[PDB]
């Protein structure tokens, strides 16, 4: 039953650590974003004067 | 006991491989260089940043070229010199970086060899004795090699600041193209420093024209920034440095048309919810001195409703394209450490990540198509003011080398890294003692309950968490020592010969069966001076068995228990080592223990004991020194049955019956292995048991 | 483009307890050991909760975030620590009874 | 229009499936046995590769 | 099936609990009896 529960959710504060170690370096090596318009074109009248 | 643990430590290697991939991944990381390195540039602007000669006969720079621009003379100080380079650019969005080719002093220039790059990279330098420089596009880092005069001594000239790195790189560069510990509780103390931080941010931007009418816009993004500061803290006129870095920008690109008329911009850069901002100290104060070991560093910091303000566009034809407004909510989230290089000063420093959240107001772009944005923007954050100040507590516990004397307080820090430490072989010796003094029942006592890895690894009081990952590193490298290639070799053999109908069941060696437990012990191996037959055949079926074995199952207590407990003395009494030390010490103890020891199995009422020093036993019982060893017999019959750890050997246990008595039932509860009945022998009347755990306990010597 | 993602503010746990006592007053019995004599999985244990969105991943590690710094997880460390000194050598050789 | 790829990987197993099955045709008899008292951890099971 | 060849009341009982290794592969290595064919078969049912 909790034993092994109970066992395992201590015995992996290696693996939560670990895991808080990985998403830090991960977040700071995180790369860029960018987002495409879309079908979509835009445009308008340029040459106001 | 000590068997699941060292199971557990064996199992839990799936992590290594995704806790090193991310360090891969993770730690990619006028000046004239000297010979064998590498140079890479990333220029601001559009024109003459770096050039490159032997300033004596032979001289290879090289030139950008503008998109949107036919073949016309440039008038560029090539060399010091306007030489006529009269190049066309017809291409969109990869560029062209074209080499000239100059032959003496005032010599001319032809063209051959341009570099084509999107994303602003190129890397030039000489290798091989010539000069080995990336060509073509981006796909592919292809090189080209240019022959000079006097090679080892081209003078490279930026007009910016670039990368120092070495030529060893070449796939590092390939793929560009395309923390000191020392923790213990016994000379180490700490300190408090909670002290109420403020700093103030500052953003600067990186804004790139298109070579052109000014329609087209290039690139408006964020750049690292850094001013400084004077407070007023507690009546000490502090002064500090700071740095402010953004990481996950999003990008828009706001392309209206293909005519040099049309308002494009090639990309923006935008903050929304999922960037951060990272911020350093060059603080005046102990603390920053003593920010070389942190034992805990937490900090609560204020959050500051930052905004942006009006930004720039300049068109000729028609009236500003006016950028409004710009929003983002600051809250601390994770505080880490780092250095910072200035004047060549780097030193320590420490950083602040923050979350970030926008808010209500829109940022509009006027005569576009575009309204309601959502994120500061890129263009000018500072809104002509000059500090964004965040206020707030900031604790540090950190802990530096203060001697034993109580009276002496440490209160520096000597440099970088401290790069003497100290050898595994010198530690072997210390570890060689505290094996004299360890205990006579407590260890025993130790060798019971499961010393799972988190009650292993909790008591340490290290300064980082990279402890456990390492250790089983540790296991990922008994490959090149002998348990992990032999738990392989054991899996390997029993599998290929549960496999083998055709020759791998015949063509090896005689047990007593076709197993695998006898047959591959006794393969080749070098015959002991003076030993029998049968003590060969017994010493090898030991040897897999003792070290198999104590990771995978027996009964009562085993030797790796006892192996497991007092390596917990040793660590928990080392009084020198450090967190990158045990990687060593618990594999040559988790290995160079258990040099010679026996194990038994029995069968109904008849038992035989054997271990690798060349020696068996066969005998039950009820009087000792009996019908002597039945080979193939013990060898199927401990082959088909878990194996029972022998603490009590042959002799041992013939000299506590025949001196001091014993009964059937604790006879019985000996030689089954169980250790209460061994303890409480131990624990009563110092027996020869106790002389037999103690040179046990030495026998666990390095 | 949203102005705030609405944090879903918390329940407070004197509240919670009240009714996770309410609730344990309607459990069962003869399953209820049933399921006390299966050793069950880490991996059920967590399974079918909530949204599958990165966050059953999420709680997951939040919990054996929280579960290292309880009393029972530093009560086992310090009876762990106590052991291994007693072992270490005569230390605690006699203080009092 | 480019942007329609479903199906990977099957063409690969489905062929090998059969080979394991006739290379498992001629498997050992008492080897299984003696190894199946072994806990063939990760450690193991994914090291004879 | 098997109780033709004896083995009675103590290789009996270990298999009815079906999972005593030792019983198992002793009746397995020497009288070559009816239960190679029935791990054979039971190999080749989990074979497809």
């Given at each position: 039953?909790?034993?092994?529960?109970?066992?395992?959710?201590?015995?992996?504060?290696?693996?939560?650590?670990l895991?808080?170690?990985?998403?830090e370096i991960?977040?700071?090596?995180?790369?860029?974003?960018?987002?495409?318009?879309?079908?979509?074109?835009?445009?308008?009248?340029?040459?106001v004067? | 006991?000590?068997?699941?643990?060292?199971?557990?430590?064996?199992?839990?290697?799936?992590?290594?491989?995704?806790?090193?991939?991310?360090?891969?991944?993770?730690?990619?990381?006028?000046?004239?260089?000297?010979?064998?390195?590498?140079?890479?540039?990333?220029?601001?602007?559009?024109?003459?940043i770096?050039?490159?000669?032997?300033?004596?006969?032979?001289?290879?720079?090289?030139?950008?070229?503008?998109?949107?621009?036919?073949?016309?003379?440039?008038?560029?100080?090539?060399?010091?010199?306007?030489?006529?380079?009269?190049?066309?650019?017809?291409?969109?969005?990869?560029?062209?970086?074209?080499?000239?080719?100059?032959?003496?002093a005032?010599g001319?220039?032809?063209?051959?060899?341009?570099?084509?790059?999107?994303?602003?990279l190129?890397?030039?330098?000489?290798?091989?004795?010539?000069?080995?420089?990336?060509?073509g596009?981006?796909?592919?880092?292809r090189?080209?090699?240019?022959?000079?005069?006097?090679?080892?001594?081209?003078?490279?000239?930026?007009?910016?600041?670039?990368?120092?790195?070495?030529?060893?790189?070449?796939?590092?560069?390939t793929?560009?193209?395309?923390?000191?510990?020392?923790?213990?509780?016994?000379?180490?103390?700490?300190?408090?420093?909670?002290?109420?931080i403020?700093?103030?941010?500052?953003?600067?931007n990186?804004?790139?024209?298109?070579?052109?009418?000014?329609?087209?816009?290039?690139?408006?993004?964020?750049?690292?920034?850094?001013?400084?500061?004077?407070?007023?803290?507690?009546?000490?006129?502090?002064?500090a440095?700071?740095?402010?870095?953004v990481?996950?920008?999003?990008?828009?690109?706001?392309?209206?048309?293909?005519?040099?008329?049309?308002?494009?911009?090639?990309?923006?850069?935008?903050?929304?919810?999922n960037?951060?901002?990272?911020?350093?100290?060059?603080?005046?104060?102990?603390?920053?001195?003593?920010?070389?070991?942190?034992?805990?560093?937490?900090?609560?910091?204020?959050?500051?409703?930052?905004?942006?303000?009006?930004?720039?566009f300049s068109?000729?034809?028609?009236?500003?394209?006016?950028?409004?407004?710009?929003?983002?909510?600051?809250?601390?989230?994770?505080?880490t450490?780092?250095?910072?290089?200035?004047?060549?000063?780097?030193?320590?420093?420490?950083?602040?990540?923050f979350r970030?959240?926008?808010?209500?107001?829109?940022?509009?772009?006027?005569?576009?198509?575009?309204?309601?944005?959502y994120?500061?923007?890129?263009?000018?954050?500072?809104?002509?003011?000059?500090?964004?100040?965040?206020?707030?507590?900031?604790?540090?516990?950190?802990?530096?080398?203060?001697?034993?004397?109580?009276?002496?307080?440490?209160?520096?820090?000597?440099?970088?890294?401290?790069?003497?430490?100290?050898?595994?072989?010198?530690?072997?010796?210390?570890?060689?003692?505290?094996?004299?003094?360890?205990?006579?029942?407590?260890?025993?006592?130790?060798?019971?309950?499961?010393?799972?890895?988190?009650?292993?690894?909790?008591?340490?009081?290290?300064?980082?968490?990279?402890?456990?990952?390492?250790?089983?590193?540790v296991?990922?490298?008994?490959?090149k020592?002998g348990?992990?290639?032999?738990?392989?070799?054991?899996?390997?053999?029993?599998?290929?010969?549960?496999?083998?109908?055709?020759?791998?069941?015949?063509?090896?060696?005689?047990?007593?069966?076709?197993?695998?437990?006898?047959?591959?012990?006794?393969?080749?191996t070098?015959?002991?001076?003076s030993?029998?037959?049968?003590?060969?055949?017994?010493?090898?079926?030991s040897?897999?068995?003792?070290?198999?074995?104590?990771?995978?199952?027996?009964?009562?207590?085993?030797?790796?228990?006892?192996?497991?407990?007092?390596?917990?003395?040793?660590?928990?009494?080392s009084?020198?080592?450090?967190?990158?030390?045990?990687?060593?010490?618990?594999?040559?103890?988790?290995?160079?223990?258990?040099?010679?020891?026996?194990?038994?199995?029995?069968?109904?009422?008849?038992?035989?004991?054997?271990?690798?020093?060349?020696?068996?036993?066969?005998?039950?019982?009820?009087?000792?020194?009996?019908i002597?060893?039945?080979?193939?017999?013990f060898?199927?019959?401990?082959?088909?049955?878990?194996?029972?750890?022998?603490?009590?050997?042959?002799?041992?246990?013939?000299?506590?019956?025949?001196?001091?008595?014993?009964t059937?039932?604790?006879a019985?509860?000996?030689?089954?292995?169980?250790?209460?009945?061994?303890?409480?022998?131990?624990?009563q009347?110092?027996?020869?048991?106790?002389?037999?755990?103690?040179?046990?306990?030495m026998?666990?010597?390095?």
């Amino acid at each position: 039953m909790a034993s092994l529960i109970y066992r395992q959710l201590l015995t992996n504060s290696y693996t939560v650590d670990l895991s808080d170690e990985i998403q830090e370096i991960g977040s700071t090596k995180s790369q860029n974003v960018t987002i495409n318009p879309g079908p979509f074109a835009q445009t308008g009248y340029a040459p106001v004067n | 006991m000590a068997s699941l643990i060292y199971r557990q430590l064996l199992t839990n290697s799936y992590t290594v491989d995704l806790s090193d991939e991310i360090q891969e991944i993770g730690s990619t990381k006028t000046f004239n260089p000297p010979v064998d390195y590498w140079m890479l540039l990333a220029p601001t602007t559009p024109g003459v940043i770096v050039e490159g000669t032997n300033n004596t006969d032979r001289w290879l720079a090289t030139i950008l070229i503008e998109p949107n621009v036919q073949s016309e003379n440039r008038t560029y100080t090539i060399f010091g010199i306007q030489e006529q380079l009269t190049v066309s650019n017809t291409s969109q969005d990869q560029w062209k970086f074209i080499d000239v080719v100059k032959t003496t002093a005032n010599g001319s220039i032809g063209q051959y060899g341009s570099l084509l790059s999107s994303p602003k990279l190129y890397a030039v330098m000489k290798h091989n004795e010539k000069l080995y420089t990336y060509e073509g596009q981006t796909p592919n880092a292809r090189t080209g090699h240019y022959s000079t005069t006097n090679y080892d001594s081209v003078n490279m000239t930026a007009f910016c600041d670039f990368y120092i790195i070495p030529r060893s790189e070449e796939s590092k560069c390939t793929e560009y193209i395309n923390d000191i510990v020392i923790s213990k509780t016994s000379l180490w103390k700490e300190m408090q420093y909670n002290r109420d931080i403020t700093i103030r941010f500052k953003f600067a931007n990186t804004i790139i024209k298109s070579g052109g009418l000014g329609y087209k816009w290039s690139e408006i993004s964020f750049k690292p920034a850094n001013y400084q500061y004077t407070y007023t803290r507690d009546g000490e006129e502090v002064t500090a440095h700071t740095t402010c870095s953004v990481n996950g920008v999003n990008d828009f690109s706001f392309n209206g048309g293909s005519l040099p008329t049309d308002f494009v911009v090639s990309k923006f850069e935008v903050i929304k919810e999922n960037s951060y901002v990272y911020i350093d100290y060059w603080d005046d104060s102990q603390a920053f001195r003593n920010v070389v070991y942190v034992r805990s560093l937490a900090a609560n910091l204020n959050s500051v409703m930052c905004t942006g303000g009006s930004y720039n566009f300049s068109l000729p034809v028609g009236q500003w394209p006016v950028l409004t407004g710009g929003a983002v909510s600051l809250h601390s989230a994770g505080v880490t450490l780092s250095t910072q290089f200035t004047d060549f000063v780097s030193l320590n420093s420490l950083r602040f990540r923050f979350r970030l959240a926008v808010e209500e107001p829109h940022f509009k772009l006027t005569r576009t198509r575009l309204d309601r944005l959502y994120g500061l923007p890129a263009a000018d954050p500072n809104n002509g003011k000059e500090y964004y100040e965040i206020a707030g507590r900031f604790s540090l516990i950190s802990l530096v080398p203060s001697n034993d004397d109580y009276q002496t307080p440490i209160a520096n820090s000597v440099t970088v890294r401290q790069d003497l430490e100290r050898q595994l072989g010198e530690l072997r010796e210390e570890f060689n003692a505290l094996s004299q003094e360890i205990a006579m029942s407590q260890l025993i006592d130790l060798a019971l309950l499961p010393l799972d890895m988190f009650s292993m690894f909790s008591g340490i009081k290290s300064t980082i968490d990279a402890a456990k990952s390492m250790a089983t590193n540790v296991m990922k490298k008994f490959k090149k020592s002998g348990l992990a290639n032999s738990v392989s070799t054991l899996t390997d053999s029993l599998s290929d010969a549960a496999s083998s109908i055709s020759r791998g069941s015949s063509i090896r060696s005689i047990g007593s069966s076709a197993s695998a437990w006898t047959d591959v012990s006794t393969q080749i191996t070098d015959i002991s001076s003076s030993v029998s037959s049968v003590s060969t055949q017994t010493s090898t079926i030991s040897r897999r068995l003792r070290l198999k074995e104590m990771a995978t199952q027996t009964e009562g207590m085993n030797f790796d228990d006892i192996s497991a407990a007092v390596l917990k003395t040793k660590i928990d009494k080392s009084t020198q080592i450090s967190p990158n030390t045990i990687p060593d010490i618990v594999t040559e103890a988790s290995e160079k223990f258990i040099p010679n020891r026996a194990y038994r199995v029995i069968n109904n009422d008849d038992v035989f004991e054997a271990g690798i020093d060349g020696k068996f036993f066969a005998y039950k019982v009820d009087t000792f020194e009996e019908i002597p060893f039945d080979v193939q017999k013990f060898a199927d019959l401990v082959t088909d049955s878990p194996v029972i750890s022998a603490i009590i050997d042959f002799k041992t246990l013939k000299n506590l019956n025949d001196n001091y008595g014993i009964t059937k039932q604790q006879a019985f509860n000996l030689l089954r292995s169980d250790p209460r009945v061994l303890r409480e022998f131990i624990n009563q009347d110092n027996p020869i048991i106790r002389n037999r755990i103690e040179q046990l306990i030495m026998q666990c010597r390095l």
